[PDB]
Amino acid sequence: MAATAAEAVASGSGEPREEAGALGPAWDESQLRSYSFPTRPIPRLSQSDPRAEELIENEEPVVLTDTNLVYPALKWDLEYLQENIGNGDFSVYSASTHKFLYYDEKKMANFQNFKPRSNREEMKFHEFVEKLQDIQQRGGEERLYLQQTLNDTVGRKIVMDFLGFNWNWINKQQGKRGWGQLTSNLLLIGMEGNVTPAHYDEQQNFFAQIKGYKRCILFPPDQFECLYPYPVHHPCDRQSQVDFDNPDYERFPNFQNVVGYETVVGPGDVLYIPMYWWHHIESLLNGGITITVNFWYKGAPTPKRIEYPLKAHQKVAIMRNIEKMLGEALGNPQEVGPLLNTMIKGRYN
Amino acid sequence: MAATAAEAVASGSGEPREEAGALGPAWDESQLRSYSFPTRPIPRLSQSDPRAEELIENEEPVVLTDTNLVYPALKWDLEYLQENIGNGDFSVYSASTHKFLYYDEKKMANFQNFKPRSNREEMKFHEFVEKLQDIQQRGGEERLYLQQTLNDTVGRKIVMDFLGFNWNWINKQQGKRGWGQLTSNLLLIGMEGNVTPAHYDEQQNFFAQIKGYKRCILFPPDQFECLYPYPVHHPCDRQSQVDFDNPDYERFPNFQNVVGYETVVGPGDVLYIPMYWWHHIESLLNGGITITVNFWYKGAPTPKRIEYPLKAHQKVAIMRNIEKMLGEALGNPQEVGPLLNTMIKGRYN
Amino acid sequence: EVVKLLLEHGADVLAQD
Amino acid sequence: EVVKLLLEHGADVLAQD
Ligand SMILES: O=C(O)CNC(=O)C(=O)O
Ligand SMILES: O=C(O)CNC(=O)C(=O)O
Ligand SMILES: [Zn+2]
Ligand SMILES: [Zn+2]
């Protein structure tokens, strides 16, 4: 029965891998949050495996198990970083719930009624660690999530570790895929259970996991209809409006047609998150703090000759520009929706 | 009671004017078709009246009673034209109903499922008159509507009459309003009861009535939401989808908020139909054949500096371009609707 | 710039061509 | 032409600026 076959292929992230030296099961299935949609698994391949090279070429997700990308960083932990990370400022988001919804501050102007559920607070790494200990101590409920681009102000050891990254392999991936420059390296340190709601980025990404475990649920760009992103001018642009813990099927009916590609990454794994692909990231429950460093690259320029029919991500590019252009042309981003509705009601819908 | 005051201002075209020499009432109210919406009257002014100059400047409709625009043409009738109009071909639409819905033939390609309710047939003016007599003779039901741009192939008398038009007055109107060139002069000869469904043109127009009477119902460009034009790529682009004889309030709910500006024009009257203004034209029932010659002018170019907020017609210009651009970018006009719906469903609606 | 692009109009009327 | 215009992409990510 094809329905039975499908219920099997929705094997999730699969069986938890058994760590070396029989150190027991890496993670438990009960450490995963429960959702209302099926998910097939993202392939776990070797960087030498031709299939992995193929998936990256067709802009499809893949977890590379042996890149040694951030090998020197696999020894990173709070104590190490606190001594070597430096004394620069670190962006740290604080929330009252596990969901850390991103919000662009430049766009909060056009939406006064928007009240962010988490707050950003600059601080020194030791303060962050301190604040991390305090919550643990007082057994509080407050949650933190450090997200900071790595810069000039990192200790010599951190700089040394950087040199030990497998630049040879990633530089080639950049060159062979025609990708633009490396724009940044986001350091992500979050508490257990922390969740980064579904969204898509406008850059290619090599998600290098360093400490703890993260469950990554991805969705193809052709599932734009099922994820309902906020209006482009909204501070939550590029994020999904659908609450995964409580989907409003009335407002977002197509979310019942959604199918994800999930996987759990651990220390040493590198997940390729293709540009435009939606992704939901969560630090496993009771798995301790997680550490990740990503690599963001500008995408390849638009081809000289356009082929048809257009690919999904191209339509996404187009829909985004339409909203932008309208916003500029009407002089007020608030008039975008009314115009669009007027344009389609009784005409195209 | 404001509701009572409003029910009075909806005086329609008003009291029928009494022609000179006590030749009885020009037209009867029973010669008008019944519709489901209210209509205030379009002003009837003298070209020397400063108000008329004002309405034209603010791109608002007005009927000019004394322009002498097509004075030499006021003697035109079937016999005269048949002798002088020439032997060039004349576009003549034939329909089985009073509604003559315009349809662009260049766009019939993108819509195979479209079957026009009227057919165009080139013929000589005498043939047209002949065919006009035949239907009258056989007492048939078929309807005709001659609509032809006046060209080089008109007799010397028709050319002579043209010279007698009040070019002085209209040339100034062109110059003072910054309008482009005169693109054409459409000759319209239709049978009694014939109707040209609501639509808007992308050119400024001076509707010069020559024979018989026409009821002109206009709607401001800000009533775009209530008229539901066909998709830009549709052969019926710029026409309203709403059947005035039978409004589908389920598909077109905002048609119940529609308010028109109507008037009845007769020989000697010149109606200014501002660019983008919607208009419904009908040759009064049992009023005989009607003759009109319009003057189409390209509009003034877009201002150097754009002011805000945008005027209604500017938003119409924008909505049109969006549909055009999308059509080009997706390579298939049929994909426009699906993209627009995807862009707004659960996002802006 | 793009605004002017979006504002530019056509000249289509109730006639062929 | 306009197609390229509509295809051009941004570089926004899950970070400020
Ligand atoms: O790590 C997270 O919780 C979220 N990461 C991203 O969204 C990313 O790397 O593009
Ligand atoms: O005369 C008619 O029946 C219709 N005329 C027009 O639509 C026009 O002149 O722009
Ligand atoms: Zn017209
Ligand atoms: Zn991301």
Q: Is A23 exposed, middle or buried (0-12, 13-18, 19+ CB in 10 A)?
A: exposed
Please report the DSSP string for B26-82 in residue order: SS-GGGSPP-SS-EEEPPEE-TTSHHHHHHHHTT--EEES---TTGGGGG--HHHHH
Q: Which two three-digit tokens encode residue A336?
A: 């975008």
The CA-based diameter of chain A, rounded to the nearest angstrom, is: 66
Contacts D3 to B, Cβ<8 Å: 328-329
* Chain C residues with CB-CB distance to B298 below 8 A: 11
Reduced to 3 states (helix: H, G, I; strand: E, B; else coil), residue B142 is coil
Q: Measured at the alpha carbon of residue A65, what is the angle toward residues A64 and A71, in degrees to the nearest 5?
A: 105
Between chain B and chain D, how many beta carbons pairs sit less than 8 Å apart?
A: 9
B263 is in an annotated binding site: no
> Which DSSP symbol is given to B16?
P
Please tell me whether residues B349 and B251 are part of one structural domain. no
User: What's the burial of B48, exposed, middle or buried (CB within 10 Å: 0-12/13-18/19+)?
Assistant: exposed
Residues of C with CB under 8 A from a CB of B: 3-17
Query: DSSP state, B239?
Result: B
Residues B278, B180: one domain?
Answer: yes
CATH of the domain at B87: 2.60.120.10
Residue type, A285: L
Contact B322 C6 (CB under 8 A): yes
| Residues B113 and B198 reside in one and the same domain | yes
Q: Are A219 and A261 in contact (CB under 8 A)?
A: yes
Residues B14 and B42 occupy one common structural domain: yes
Distance, CA of A311 to chain centre: 22
Are B186 and B158 in a shared domain? yes
Instruction: Mark whether A132 and A235 lie in a shared domain.
Output: yes
Residue B179 to residue B127: CA distance in whole angstroms: 37
d(CA A81, CA A87): 11
Helix A336-344 to helix A312-330 angle (10° resolution) is 120
Nearest-angstrom CA–CA distance, A63 and A256: 26
Count of domains for chain B: 2
Q: Residue A186: enclosing H or E segment and its boundaries?
A: strand A186-190
A–C interface: beta-carbon pairs under 8 A: 9
Same domain, A87 and A126: yes
- The Cα of A230 is separated from the nearest Cα of chain B by a number of Å equal to 6
Between CA A39 and CA A279 the distance in angstroms is 12
Is A320 strand, coil or helix?
helix
Q: Tell me how far apart the alpha carbons of residues B210 and B74 are, in angstroms, rounded to a whole number.
A: 5
Sign of torsion over alpha carbons A69, A72, A75, A79: negative
Between strands B182-184 and B290-297, the pairing is antiparallel
CA distance linking residue A291 with residue A73, whole number of Å: 10
Same domain, B191 and B318: no
Ligand 2 contact via B292 beta carbon (within 6 Å): yes
- The residue type of A183 is T
Half-sphere exposure of B161 (CA within 13 A, CB side): 18
Strands A186-190 and A182-184: unpaired
- Distance between CA atoms of residues A339 and B162, nearest Å: 44
Residues A332 and A241 in one domain: no
H or E element that contains A291? strand A290-297
Q: What is the DSSP string of A220-269?
A: -GGGHHHH-BBPTTSTTBTBB-S-TTS--TTT-GGGGS--EEEEEE-TT-
Provide residues of C within 8 Å CB-CB of chain A. Answer: 2-3, 6-7
CB B263 within 8 A of CB B213: no
How many other β-carbons are positioned within 10 Å of the β-carbon of residue B201? 21
Tell me, yes or no, whether B166 and B265 share the same domain.
yes
Element (H, E) at B327: helix B312-330
Q: Which residues of B touch C2 (CB under 8 A)?
A: none
> Nearest-5° angle of CA B160, CA B161, CA B162?
90
Query: Cα separation of B221 and B200, whole Å?
Result: 9
SS3 A149: strand
The closest alpha carbon to A296, from A162, A160, A174, belongs to A174
Contact A211, A261 (CB under 8 A): no
Q: How far apart are the C-alpha atoms of B340 and B348, rounded to whole Å? A: 11
Euclidean distance between CA atoms B61 and B281, whole angstroms: 14
Q: d(Cα B214, Cα B282) in Å, to the nearest integer?
A: 6
Q: What is the largest CA-CA distance in chain C?
A: 32
Alpha carbon of B262 to those of B11, B217, B273: distances in Å? 9, 4, 11
Residue B336: give the domain boundaries: 306-349
**CB B348: neighbour CB atoms within 10 A?**
15
Cα torsion B123, B127, B131, B134 to 10°: value is -160
Domain co-membership, B246 together with B326? no
Do the beta carbons of residue B105 and residue B70 sit within 8 Å? no
Work out which ligand 1 atom sits closest to the CA atom of A196.
3
Residues B146 and B294 in one domain: yes
CATH number of the domain to which B335 belongs: 1.10.287.1010
Give the residue, out of B147, B279, B280, B291, with the most ligand 2 atoms within 8 A of its beta carbon, to mutate for a pocket test: B279
User: How far apart, in whole angstroms, are the C-alpha atoms of residue A74 and residue B329?
Assistant: 47
The DSSP result for B250-310, as a single string, is: TT-GGGGS--EEEEEE-TT-EEEE-TT-EEEEEE-TTS--EEEEEEEEPPPPPPSS--SSP
Ligand 2, atom 7: nearest CA belongs to which residue?
C14
* Burial bucket for residue B37 (CB in 10 Å: 0-12, 13-18, 19+): middle
Exposure letters A59-74 (e unless 16+ CB within 10 A, then b): bbbbbbbebbbbebbb
d(Cα A263, Cα A43) in Å, to the nearest integer?
8
